[PDB]
């Protein structure tokens, strides 16, 4: 438990900005000097060590600082191939920083927007099996979060990151990266919520659980199979999305569901529909979602 040396973080560019600070892409100066029990980092000789750095504005309120430190504690526990990894912190003096691995292909929404489905769309291709592999990795990371008794609360392709060889890491940007403002609705005062990804019980009663994470996974998987080309419920206004949550509650058959993506087979679609069951206990666990995507869907190509 010692700070990473801030003087070794060499700025390259801004990855995001928000009310309370920024995210920077940095290079670690001569990273081999640091390798030890205290910092057992992975350096590849001949390859720069790139890292992402979340930084709190030095004039932040005391409550903002407590938020940042709480996030540090959470991140310090996360150790999984499909979750973003904490490499070090700077917290003994200001500005507070947290340092993670850098995912070189950006967020999953950006990534998939730039791809087309393997045979006018443009750019590099991505196959249907590769899309199942992207989704399986998200289910695997979420399964791990759930076993540690964490609820994500904002699962969407915008909070997933892409590294080498189609590797996905779940992340959560909170207010550090004010992209995608069009995905959040202002329900009260200064509070904005990702209503198009939220289970009806989240919207009506502010109840967030692994089962509402499963509901958001359904929507995220719909995004993946659509190659991020369309907003969920894009035919409906925000106020109509809220009304739709009310119809899940009323349960009289007026509720509407996201349509089957063209690249989605009927069984996978029926699994997505189960993610949107009215009753929490009827939604599939992430173990079952992962298995379906890694086995069933693959064996029936
Ligand atoms: C510097 C940095 C700091 C922090 C985080 C961050 O993701 N923190 C986080 C906090 C909590 C949770 C879990 N909880 C969620 C809430 N929940 C209520 C409790 C459970 C998780 C999660 F991944 F587990 F979800 C992540 C990401 C970055 C980044 C970066 C980066 C790296 N490559 C790139 C390339 C382009 C852009 N950015 N970027
Ligand atoms: C129509 C409608 C529109 C908007 C909102 C709304 O603003 N919901 C809201 C959800 C969550 C949060 C955030 N949370 C985080 C964690 N926390 C532990 C709970 C707070 C907030 C926030 F404002 F606090 F951000 C608001 C609610 C309704 C409703 C309803 C309702 C309730 N029972 C019934 C029965 C029949 C019909 N409707 N209905």
Author numbering: 602 to 720, 732 to 913
Give verbatim excerpts from the published study on this entry:
The discoidin domain receptors (DDRs), DDR1 and DDR2, are unique among the receptor tyrosine kinases (RTKs) in being activated by interaction with the extracellular matrix. Overall, DDR1 displays the classical bilobal architecture of a tyrosine kinase. As observed for ABL, both type II inhibitors induce an inactive conformation of DDR1 characterized by a “DFG-Asp out, αC-Glu in” configuration.
Ponatinib is a third-generation TKI developed for the treatment of CML patients with resistance to imatinib. DDR1 was monomeric in the imatinib complex, consistent with its size-exclusion profile, whereas the ponatinib complex formed a crystallographic dimer with an additional ponatinib molecule bound at the dimer interface. By design, ponatinib binds at the same site with the loss of one hydrogen bond owing to the ethynyl linker, which removes any polar interaction with the gatekeeper residue Thr701. In addition to the remaining four hydrogen bonds, there are extensive hydrophobic interactions across the DDR1 pocket, although the π–π interaction with Phe785 is broken. The added trifluoromethyl group occupies the pocket vacated by the inverted DFG motif and forms favorable hydrophobic contacts with Leu679, Ile684, Ile685, Leu757 and Ile782. ITC measurements suggested that the ponatinib interaction was slightly stronger than imatinib, with a calculated KD of 1.3 nM. Similar potency was observed in U2OS cells, where ponatinib inhibited collagen-induced DDR1 autophosphorylation with an EC50 of 2.5 nM. Interesting in this respect is the ponatinib molecule that stabilizes the crystallographic dimer in the kinase–inhibitor complex.
